[PDB]
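Hi D.,

Good news: the full-assembly prediction came through. Inputs first.
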Amino acid sequence: IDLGRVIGELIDHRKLIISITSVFTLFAILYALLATPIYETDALIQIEQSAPETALLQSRMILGKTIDDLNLQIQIEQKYFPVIGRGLARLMGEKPGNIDITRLYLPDSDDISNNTPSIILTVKDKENYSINSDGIQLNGVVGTLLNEKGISLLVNEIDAKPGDQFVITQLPRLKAISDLLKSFSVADLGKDTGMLTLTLTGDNPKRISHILDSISQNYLAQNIARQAAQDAKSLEFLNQQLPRAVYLQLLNRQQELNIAKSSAIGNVRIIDNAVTDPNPVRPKKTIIIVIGVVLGLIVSVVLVLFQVFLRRGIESPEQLEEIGINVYASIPISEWDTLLAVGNPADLAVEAIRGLRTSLHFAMMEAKNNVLMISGASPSAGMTFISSNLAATIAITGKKVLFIDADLRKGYAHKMFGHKNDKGLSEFLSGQAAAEMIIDKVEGGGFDYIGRGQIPPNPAELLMHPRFEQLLNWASQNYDLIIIDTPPILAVTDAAIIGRYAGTCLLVARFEKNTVKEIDVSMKRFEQSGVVVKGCILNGVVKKASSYYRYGHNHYGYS
Amino acid sequence: IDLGRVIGELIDHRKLIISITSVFTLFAILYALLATPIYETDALIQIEQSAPETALLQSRMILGKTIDDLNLQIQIEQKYFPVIGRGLARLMGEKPGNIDITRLYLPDSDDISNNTPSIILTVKDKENYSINSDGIQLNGVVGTLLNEKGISLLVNEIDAKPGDQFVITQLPRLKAISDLLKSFSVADLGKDTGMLTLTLTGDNPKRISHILDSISQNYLAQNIARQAAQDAKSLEFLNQQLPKVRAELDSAEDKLNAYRKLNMEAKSVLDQIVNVDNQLNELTFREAEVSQLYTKEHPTYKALMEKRQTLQEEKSKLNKRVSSMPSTQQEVLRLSRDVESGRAVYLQLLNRQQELNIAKSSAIGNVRIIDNAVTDPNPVRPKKTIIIVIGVVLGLIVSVVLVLFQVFLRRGIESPEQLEEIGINVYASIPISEWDTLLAVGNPADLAVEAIRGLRTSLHFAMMEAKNNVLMISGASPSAGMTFISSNLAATIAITGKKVLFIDADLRKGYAHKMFGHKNDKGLSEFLSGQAAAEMIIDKVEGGGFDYIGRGQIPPNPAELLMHPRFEQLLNWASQNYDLIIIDTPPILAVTDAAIIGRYAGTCLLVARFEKNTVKEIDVSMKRFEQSGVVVKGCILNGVVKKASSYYRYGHNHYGYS
Ligand SMILES: Nc1ncnc2c1ncn2[C@@H]1O[C@H](COP(=O)(O)OP(=O)(O)O)[C@@H](O)[C@H]1O
Ligand SMILES: Nc1ncnc2c1ncn2[C@@H]1O[C@H](COP(=O)(O)OP(=O)(O)O)[C@@H](O)[C@H]1O
Ligand SMILES: [Mg+2]
Ligand SMILES: [Mg+2]
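Then the structure:
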C-alpha cells in the first residue's frame, strides 16, 4: 500500500464517507440545538481555614434550611410530550410558561417504587385551572385554597397561555436536598485564602441566583449566630448572676456583652452576591459538532479499511496474467430482452466485444475445427451475454454463425432472440426430432440458433450421446463459426462434456465477483477432464480510482 | 494468519461465541438482579486532633454500648429456602416482613462448634405464633412473655403474612460488635479539620440510620457526661463500693469453697437467673444515666421501665421454679447465684470505673451533631452496569480463547490444495448430501450426485490407457466414503448405457447387499471358498441398472481367501462381459485386503474424508499401497462443507445451478 492506493480508496468510497459523516454531524447538530441550556451562577465569600467551611456549606443543615425557605420541594415541569418538544419549542421562540405555588400536599401514596406523588395541572385561562392525578378531574381557582380528595393546593400568578400542562411533584425533602447538592459546588481558589467561590448550575437563570443568595445568607446568619453564642451565654449567665461597685461593674460588663452580641460580625463575609452568567455553560455547541465530525470521519475510515481488506475479487487482468491465464478482453458495464449488439451497436461494451472478435480471429487459427465454447466459473458471470453478442458482431462481417445454447438447465436464449420454443437441442438429443427442425433465425441478428428446448431430467447424460457429436460434425460443414453456450463448470459438469468437441474454449470471469483462485480451479478442472482452455475474458469492468493509482485507465471513449 | 483468516474463523464459530456470551451475560444479569441491595447512611459531627477520636469511635467500648442499647445481638432472618428466594421475592413485589423482639434468651447449648443457638418462628396470625428449636413445638402470643424449657422469648408487633418463617439467633456479643465494626467507618474529610464523617452500610435502610444515630448520640453523651462528671460524686461513689463489693465477692467465694469441701435444670435456671441479674444491674445503670441526661416521658425511658417489668416477671418465674426443687439443689443454686452475681457485678463496676476514668481524660469540648444519619435510597451495591459489562467481556474473551484453541488443534484436511502440494491428484470434491437407499437413485438432482458426475467425467479420461477395465476404490480410515462413492459412481455410470459390475470385496463389514436389496445366499465368499459358481453370485440392483456381487457370509479368513486364484479367474471372466468393474475394499491402514485386491485392478483411487483424515495419513496410505506393488492413481476428497475461512483463504469452489 502507498499514498496512491489510499487516495484511490477514499475517492472510490466517497459516497459512503459523505453519507456517514453527514448523518453523524446531523445528529450532533440536532443534539446541540435541542439540549436544554444550563446556566451557571457564582458568588464570592470571604473568610477571615476554608477546609471545614466547605463541608459545612454542603451539609444537610444549610441546604435543608434553604429547601424549607424557598419551597424547593415543589417541582414544576411544563409538559411537552416528546424528548424534543422542549428544544423545538425554545427554538420556535415561545417563552416558557411558569406558575407560582406556595402550598402543596398530595395524599402521599408512597408505594414500593413511586416515592414521589405527582399530578398534572392544565391551564384554562389566567385564573382557573384543572387538576388530575390518576384521572380524577378537579377544578381550582387562583387565590382560594383547595382541600379536596386528600389534596391541598394553592397556585398563584399563573403566567402561561391556555392549554399548557404542568407536571407537579412534591419530591421528598431528602431528594430535594440531594438534587440541590448535586448542582452546588464550592472551591477555595487559593488553597489558603479566605476566598470561596460558590457555584450553582441550573436551567432557570433567575431561580438559581435566588437559591444561591438564600444559601449564602443562611450560612452567614448561622455563622454570626455561632459567633454571638458565646457572648449571649455569658450575658445570660450575668443576668442569672445579678443579685454596689460590683453591681455597676456587672452592669458595664452586661452592656459590653450586649454590644458584642448585637454586632457579632463573624469571620465570614459576602463579597459577591450571586449573578447568573447569561451564556449557558452547556451544551457546548462547537465541541459537540467537532466531536461529531471527527467521529464520523474515523467511523467512515475504519469501515473503508474493513471493506478494502475483505475484498477478494478480481481487480484487473494483471492478476489473471500473473498466474499464466491469457485475458483476451475486458468488457465494461453497459448501462444502456434484446441483444445489445443490435439495440445500441455504438455502445462501449460492443466495442470491447469487437476487440475480442479481433483477438479471436487470430487465436482461432491452427485450431482443430471451427467450434468455440464459452464457459465460466460461476453463474451470472456474462457467458450468455458475451456469447450472444459475440455471435452478433461476428455475423455482421458477412460470416455464417451458429449459436447453440447447450445450457439445458436455465437457458433463455430463445426468449432473447424471439422464439418458436418447440424442438430445441433436447428434442434432438433424445431422438424425437431432426437436425433440420431445431435451427431458427434471429430477427435483428443474422445468425442461426438452436435453443435448449424443454428442460430434460437428465441433462448431463443427454450430452454424452453421439448424436451431439453428429450434430457438431454436420454443422461444422455448413457454418463458418459455431458458438456453444454452456453452464458453469464449478456448478455442473456439462461444460467439460461439451468441451471435448470444441476446438477453442474460453472462460468468462466476472470483474468483482469471481476470484483468481476460483478461475485457477476452473481451468484445472477443465484440463483434468481432457479440455484445454485457451484463455479468459474479464467482464463487467468499472472504472475505479484505486485501479488508476495501481494499474491505469485501460479504456477510453472515442466518438 | 491475517484479517481474512481470523474473520473467517469468527464467522464459522459464530454459534459457539454467541451461545457462550449469552450464557455469561445471563448469569451476570441474574446475579445483578438477585443480589441483596446494600444501602449506606452517613452523619456529620463537629469536634473542637481527630486522630484519637477516629480510633476511640471504633473501639469495643462505644460499639458495645450501642449493641447493648439496641439489642443488636438478636439476629432475625426471614426464611427463603433456596439461595435465590430472597431476590425473586423482592422482585415479585412482596414486601419483606419483620418482627420486633425485645427479650431473647436461648438455653445456650454452647457445644464445640454451634456457638450461636438458633430457633425458627412461624407466624400463624397477627397475634399468635409458633416456635421450634429442635422439633419441640411451642405456641406463643404477642405481648405475654414465654418462659419454657429454659427459653425466654418476647415478641411485639408481628408484621408479616401467615405462613412466614424466621430464623432467630442470639449471636455472641463480640460477634455482634465485629459485624457492626466491619461495615462502619469514620473519616475526617479534611485530614486536619474538626469535621468527622461517619458512615455505615447495611441491607436495611431504616435500621442502619437508627444504629448510626445511636452511635453519634452515645459519643455526644459520653463527652457531655464527662464535662458534667467533674463535680459529680459518681467517681468517689464507685471508689467506695468497689472494695465493699470485692469483700462481699471474697466472702461468697470462701463460703462456696467451704461448702464444696450438677442437675441440668439446676444449672439452667442458675445461668438464667445470672443473666436476669446482669440485665437488671445494667438496666439500673442505664436508667440512672438516661434519667440524668433525658426525660421520663422520653420513649427510651418508657422502654427501660417496660424491660424492667419484663425482667422482674422473668425473675419471679425463675424464683417460683427454684422454690419447687429439692433443698440440696437450691442450696448449691444459691451458692452459685451469690458467686456469679458477685463476680459479674465486680466486672461491671470495673468497666464503669474504666469508662469514667477514660472519659475524664478527654480533651475535647462539647460535641456538636451537625447532620444526623439519613439513608441514601439508591443502593451502593451491587453495581449492576459494571457487573453486566464484566460479564459481557468475560464471555467474549473466553469464547475467543476457545476458538483459538480449536483452530490451533485442528489437523484435518481443509482443501484439495493441501493434498495437491504433496503431489496427490484430487479428482473430485463430493459435498455433504443432507438429503439404506442409493443417493444417485432417490435424489438424482442432488449436489453430491453432481459432484459424482464430475468425478465420472474425470475418470472417463483417467482410465484410458489402463491395462484393463477394473477400478478399485479404497481409503485410509473406515467410514470415509468408499462404499458411498463406489455405489453412487456405479449408479451414475450405469445410466449412460454402459454395463457395470459392482463387487463388494469387503468381506468383513460390507453392507452393499442390504443397500441394494439382497439375496444374501452365494456372495463372494462362497465363490472363493469353492462352494459356489461364477453365475450364481451375480445379482441385479432394483433402481440401479448394474449388477452386484455381495460379500456373502463373513469368512473367518478374509485376507487368505482373496489370494486364492479363483478371485483372478472371476475378474478375468467378468472383464470380458462388462464395460466397467468397481471393487469396494476395506481401508488400507486397518487391514491388508485392499493391497491384495489391488494387484488385479487397473486403476486405484483413495477416498479422503474432509475434516477427519490428515495429509500425512493419505501420504502413508499411498506409500503403503505403492510398497506392495499397487500404483494409486489419485485421491477423491469427500464430505466437503462450505466455510468462511476457506473462502478468505481459497474461494467458493462449488455452486448450485437449477
Ligand atoms: N457487461 C454487462 N453489461 C450489462 N449487463 C450484463 C453484462 N454482463 C452480463 N450482463 C447482464 O447480467 C445478467 C447475467 O448475465 P448472463 O450471461 O445472462 O448469466 P450466465 O453467465 O450465468 O449465463 C444478464 O441479465 C446480463 O444481461
Ligand atoms: N458425501 C456424503 N454425504 C452424506 N453421507 C455420506 C457421504 N459420504 C459417506 N456418507 C455416509 O456416511 C456413512 C459412512 O460411509 P461408508 O462409505 O459406508 O463407510 P466405509 O467407507 O468405511 O465403507 C455412510 O452411512 C454414508 O452413507
Ligand atoms: Mg447462461
Ligand atoms: Mg465400505
